């Protein structure tokens, strides 16, 4: 009665039930399996899905809007995709639907992030193949040594009213291309923090206004978290973003937790019992009660594949 260990999965939530799909361990987890975690009790439940089952992937980007699951991109056995899936989780045994969206989709990619705002799914960044698009792409020279890949700063809207892709004209200093950054939404602000770009794992924090499409760099007073990728960034209030884990430039696995205070524009390191449990490429979801549920991810450097310590642990932070 317990999901198998994994990194690079997806977790999304309604604040009470956490849904978990995909990822890989030591290859991929079964595509048709949808593990559900009750946040109040603490038990699991696996359901097989039918329909347009998406392929088994890592680095996919997923959201829950009114108990409907949406999924974009990721990396499967044959590379990155820009396929978009939804899955109504209110219904019968659940069924995936692959939406053949109108307009020009994002390039195929993984390890990106998304903001939910009104009718809009707004995607940012990623790693995948070369894109006639709005934004900048930046090759990762190590991927030439097949299909070479790289990072982008693309912003993409999927309007769920007509399921049509588009790109907003943004103003301001957009963050550099990046992937394995973390995205968080509060009101009309799409926060992105950290991520890997070229040869760094970064500590910069920006937000995109989802009304005015203005990019703003935030410069907090005092101590900031160390640069990182594969971290999780979670809204826990109208005013606080909860950050945990990740992976540094110098390949350190991270176990530190922080809250970003939006009103104060200040970081606050959060002390917790899980300091021996660093994680990366895990997922985080907020509970309605007031918690952040960390599931899965790896404990050490996942880049050493044959030694990777992938996890099925639930970590619970009282924020």
């Amino acid at each position: 009665a317990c999901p198998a260990e994994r990194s690079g999965h997806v977790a999304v939530s309604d604040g009470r039930h956490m849904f978990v799909w995909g990822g890989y361990k030591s290859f991929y987890l079964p595509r048709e399996e949808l593990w559900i975690y009750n946040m109040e009790t603490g038990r699991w439940k696996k359901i097989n899905t039918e329909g347009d089952v998406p392929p088994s992937m890592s680095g996919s980007c997923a959201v829950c809007v009114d108990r409907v699951l949406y999924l974009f991109g990721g990396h499967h056995s044959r590379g990155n995709t820009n396929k978009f899936y939804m899955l109504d989780s209110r219904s019968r045994v659940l069924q995936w639907e692959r939406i053949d969206c109108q307009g020009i989709p994002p390039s195929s990619k993984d390890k990106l992030g998304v903001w939910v705002y009104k009718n809009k799914l707004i995607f940012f960044g990623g790693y995948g193949y070369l894109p006639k698009v709005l934004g900048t792409f930046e090759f990762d020279e190590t991927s030439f040594w097949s299909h070479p890949r790289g990072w982008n700063d693309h912003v993409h809207i999927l309007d769920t009213e007509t399921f049509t892709w588009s790109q907003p004209i943004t103003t301001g200093k957009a963050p550099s291309p990046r992937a394995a950054h973390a995205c968080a939404t509060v009101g009309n602000r799409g926060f992105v923090f950290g991520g890997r770009y070229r040869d760094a794992r970064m500590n910069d924090l920006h937000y995109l206004n989802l009304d005015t499409w203005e990019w703003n760099e935030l410069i907090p007073q005092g101590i900031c978290p160390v640069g990182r990728s594969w971290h999780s960034l979670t809204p826990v209030s109208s005013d606080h973003l909860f950050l945990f884990g990740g992976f540094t430039t110098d390949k350190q696995p991270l176990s530190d937790a922080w809250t970003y205070c939006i009103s104060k524009n200040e970081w606050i390191q959060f002390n917790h019992p899980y300091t021996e449990k660093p994680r990366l490429w895990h997922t985080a979801c907020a509970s309605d009660e007031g918690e952040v549920i960390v599931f899965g991810g790896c404990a050490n450097n996942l880049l050493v594949h044959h030694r990777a310590a992938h996890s099925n642990e639930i970590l619970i932070f009282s924020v």
Binding site: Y24, M57, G74, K111, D140, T142, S143, R149, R196, S229
Partner: peptide
Amino acid sequence: IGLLGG
């Protein structure tokens, strides 16, 4: 695999 670029 999917590890790259993070």
